[PDB]
Design a protein around this ligand. Sequence first.
Ligand SMILES: [Ca+2]
Ligand SMILES: [Ca+2]
Ligand SMILES: [Ca+2]
Ligand SMILES: [Ca+2]
Ligand code: NI
Ligand code: NI
Ligand code: NI
Ligand code: NI
Lengths: 237, 237, 237, 237
Amino acid sequence: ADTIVAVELDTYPNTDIGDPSYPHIGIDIKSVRSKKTAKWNMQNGKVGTAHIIYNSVDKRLSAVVSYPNADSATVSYDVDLDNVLPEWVRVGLSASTGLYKETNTILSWSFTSKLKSNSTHETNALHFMFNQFSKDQKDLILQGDATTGTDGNLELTRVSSNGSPQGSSVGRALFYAPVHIWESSAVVASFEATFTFLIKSPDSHPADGIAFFISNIDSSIPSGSTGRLLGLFPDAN
Amino acid sequence: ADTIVAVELDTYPNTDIGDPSYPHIGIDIKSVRSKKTAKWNMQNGKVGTAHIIYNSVDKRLSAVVSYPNADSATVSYDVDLDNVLPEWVRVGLSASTGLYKETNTILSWSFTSKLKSNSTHETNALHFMFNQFSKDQKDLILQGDATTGTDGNLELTRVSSNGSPQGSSVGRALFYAPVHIWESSAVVASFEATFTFLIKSPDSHPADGIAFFISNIDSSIPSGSTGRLLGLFPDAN
Amino acid sequence: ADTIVAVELDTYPNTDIGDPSYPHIGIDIKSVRSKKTAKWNMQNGKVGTAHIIYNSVDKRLSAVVSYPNADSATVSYDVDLDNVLPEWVRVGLSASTGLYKETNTILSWSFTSKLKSNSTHETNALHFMFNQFSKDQKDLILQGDATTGTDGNLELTRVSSNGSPQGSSVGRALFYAPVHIWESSAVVASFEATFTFLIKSPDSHPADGIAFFISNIDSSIPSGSTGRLLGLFPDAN
Amino acid sequence: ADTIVAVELDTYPNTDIGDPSYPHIGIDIKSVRSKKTAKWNMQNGKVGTAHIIYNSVDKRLSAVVSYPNADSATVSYDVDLDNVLPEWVRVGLSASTGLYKETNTILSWSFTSKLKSNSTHETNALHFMFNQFSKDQKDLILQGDATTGTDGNLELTRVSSNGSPQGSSVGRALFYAPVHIWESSAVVASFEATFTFLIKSPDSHPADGIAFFISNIDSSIPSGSTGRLLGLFPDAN
Ligand SMILES: [Ca+2]
Ligand SMILES: [Ca+2]
Ligand SMILES: [Ca+2]
Ligand SMILES: [Ca+2]
Ligand code: NI
Ligand code: NI
Ligand code: NI
Ligand code: NI
């Protein structure tokens, strides 16, 4: 059904489906079983920043995640996205909790997409930046338990009144407009995405993670994708 | 029904509904009868550029239109748009022909919107730029006779195969995503729009014009708004 | 000698040279005696944000200053800058202390300048953004007591080791490259500047203020402009 | 003496110093003998566009050159620029003619540089765009025979009144402000440059080419670098 390309910030090690034995960042190409991962020294309760870049000349999806005063983690994977995704896609953020939980709060999110064609100066571009989310954010499609406006933040999974994260939750937020990522006369297509997040758990084992993803425009949350499947995949294949 | 704020590039003088006796640029606030106009030395067959700017501190909508090697025309009007429009709007381009006609071709269009709130650095922004339109432009809502892809251009009104403009035509193109133009904690909201066009008529009296407009998100073409009403207003009141 | 256009964030009321009896924001056109001022509820020790905008169609210089959780102050003045400044200028930040003092710390500064000419799509632009200053910032010209790198901030006036502001200090920082603000074929010239600051004093009466300014490219600090003259004017005329 | 990293658009095949037997685009790292080249189907008298991209996560310098209605040429090379260049550099365009000649006209040039550090949202950026050059362009350092203003274009090598290119010419234009390309707390540094050019020769064998380059801030034209050395290298080593 959906075609998903995602960069996951995976907080819980599910070693039975291929995760390493630690928090990690990974690049998922149509499967929760990451094609490449890197150890991520996740900091509970601290605001982090994730940067994702890609361009059609090099065909390498790379992501860098860091916390203030700390060294960053980075992961890269050679993949030609024109061979994986459709030419029109929607970009979004997804997150889940299962038996273990954590808040999956997004404080800001920016995305820039550029298609430069061969006609002298023909640049088509799309850029959006949210540094504050309001209760009725009409340019975002919120799916599942995701909500906006609480402290001007985007809460991808359920948090009850007293600030506590709830288990078995799943929510996604996609930018309203389709994004054009390939066109026959384009000589270079590129995108850059940045988002700051705050993962906080009252427990020693937070779960499950946050993922930036790109999908077919009509993507919806697969049934049963709470927990380890990050609201993105229908199974662990 | 719709709330329309528009900058018109009016090619035909309908003196019975208040137009001056020449081509002109005007600022229309919920009525085809422009609140302010300026003489426009329209050049048949030449590519022109229109720039529209506005910000919530000054509350002045201003537009400048020019052709290469020619002096420009400019018109300004003091209007507080928070008192006219909703906080969520869609922006677009509209054009029509009636008994007289002209092609209403758009070669490029860019728009930037910014809402800066009082939280240190809280800037929400939206920017899109089209320098080429493809046949299935999924991020544009095309209404009426508007079509994209012909020579990579956006044709707002019908043009038959041999390049000829057809009379009694009306078409509009709106960017897919809603635009947020007011928010309770914003200290300055501003937008800037730019578009290049090519109006060409085989006749001495081209009609009717092109207009950049901002409307309620669900705006559609009013019945009978071909001709002098520019695909924007239901009557000449 | 220099031609100065500045937006001042004046913390000390010098009623003998025309200040109102409170902290205020003012627009200074070649004189410390502001052409227009607005009361500013200055918050000692809090990080504030100042936004300055202007465009050649409207000819209105406007500034908005705000603190988180507080209402903002705004001041506007109709002035045609092509009649005041040269076509090539340098932009900068200035600050001083006299018998009373305060820290004049800049945490970030961005500036965007655009000159759109009548040649279809001819846009010349300049944009810089500093969210962190390093000890050897080669793209800034630092004058007087200004220094960069201390906590990644720009300190316009002297602060001694223990974090204390020193009196009788004056410092300015200008972006290295000249900025083009007028050109014969330009149909609209515009700029936007934003900077966040932290004014902190151990005293009940902080002095003297911070100012964003635009000057002739070779501007230097006038002799004796500590205190009330903000490192910008040679006298109080 | 200078440290040069350059992308050359080489119009003349000097097979004795390693050029292939055709026009080509190459990546030069401190030597005119390109580390990697790709065949370039150069079109005499047509306006072309060159795009150069690089980021510190991937460490790959890539360039794409194309002409309207034609397939593009692309070349890539894995190189860590932090190991080659200083942290502060100047970027520019260079061109030369020797016994064979061609005009080396630049019609537009844009550059964007970004340093994202690990402090949440700490983005330092620099962007400039020239779509028109004036006779006294104060933000450009012109070296050798380079001049601006002729038809609003930048002429890197001498062209006599009647529009004819002169042999044995060399000229360079660098943006005035230093560019910061590395900083100790940066997690991703990236740049993108774009320029459109018009190479025209009355002869069947045009020479010598145009190059986009990055150098130490005080770089000047090496003695005797007309011809095959592109105004960049002192010898053919
Ligand atoms: Ca997992
Ligand atoms: Ca009319
Ligand atoms: Ca004062
Ligand atoms: Ca050669
Ligand atoms: Ni994983
Ligand atoms: Ni009219
Ligand atoms: Ni004052
Ligand atoms: Ni070569």
